[PDB]
């Protein structure tokens, strides 16, 4: 989804594949709904 509809550069990509905080945080700061939705998915899947 990300590469298709948001055209991240190769640098941002190889950061992602590492799960690199820089790109994840900067993307949330740009508010891509996709990334926030994934993190919300993770949060909700925590059902104590």
């Amino acid at each position: 989804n990300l590469n298709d509809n948001y055209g991240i550069s190769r640098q941002q990509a190889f950061n992602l594949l590492r799960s690199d905080p820089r790109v994840l945080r900067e993307f949330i700061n740009q508010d891509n709904p996709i990334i926030r939705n994934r993190i919300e998915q993770l949060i909700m899947q925590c059902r104590l």
Binding site: N3, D4, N5, Y6, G7, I8, S9, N32
Partner: protein, 397 residues
Amino acid sequence: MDVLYSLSKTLKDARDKIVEGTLYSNVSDLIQQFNQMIITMNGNEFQTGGIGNLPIRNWNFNFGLLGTTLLNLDANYVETARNTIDYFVDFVDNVCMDEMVRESQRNGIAPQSDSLRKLSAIKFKRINFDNSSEYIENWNLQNRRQRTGFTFHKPNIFPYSASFTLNRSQPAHDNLMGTMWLNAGSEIQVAGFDYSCAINAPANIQQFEHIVPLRRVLTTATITLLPDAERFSFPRVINSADGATTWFFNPVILRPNNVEVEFLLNGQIINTYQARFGTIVARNFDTIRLSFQLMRPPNMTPAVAVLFPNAQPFEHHATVGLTLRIESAVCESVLADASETLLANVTSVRQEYAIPVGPVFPPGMNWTDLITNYSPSREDNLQRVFTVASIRSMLIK
């Protein structure tokens, strides 16, 4: 841009007409125009690609002169013709795709790919075929500023917006009086619902008033109106405003009474419909208003009293809905539809080579996010890319 439609129709006519055996004069004119296209295009470099991950190709033109001296067609002529038109269609589609993923904020109808920027030089304006189809027709026209028009079946005009509003509220959510609606695609389904069935309101009739504003002035639309909430007719469990409470709505349906639809334009009322059902025609509008009354029955037989207790504890709620579908129309701006294939090609060609999003277009060409904030620059950029999509659409379907 016109040169692109020229080359497109050139290649399309070469693909369909000229095959061995026919009469020459039946194709001779076409052959002459094709040969002139060749003569004038040979001897110029064209550099496609150079952004994103899309391949960066070069193009050189030195194709010879196809013979006009023949009278009946041989297999070798069409052999060469096919061998060459393959090259040409590949060229045209690559330059199209390249122009696709480009944009700007100033002059949103301007050339943007280097191939086209070179090509719109006047020394290629001596090969142009016609303007036969619809999209390039409108492009040329709006360039000359007469009236515009595109024919749409099911014009997906509104965004998706599932919203509701409350007129009489309760903290326990047990005396609701308000409205719900779902507006998306081409369809609008808006319903007004009540719990007390006007047991406190004057004259036993409850009024509802609802608005839907559009963002472009459509034209000459047929609209079907049907008396029901075709998507609000089942028990529901819905969040409240801040999403801290969930409320229960169990419907029963009546007729909508004194149904008053008004197509308004420019702060003025334009056209009316009262108690007319089924299919209607509207000339020119940008806003729809639906004012409808929900009536209490005057007499009730044994079955009904359980449905409506005169006291405050209620179980079943009354509701009346309207279904509104704009069947077909013609737009003075550009829109998508359900019967063409422009949006799909735009999105696909943007999706493939991982083009970094531009500063103007919205992400993923999300149509609804576009429509919610239709702005003229984005509009003209749409029109541009849609003409280019049509161009591509005649060459490799």
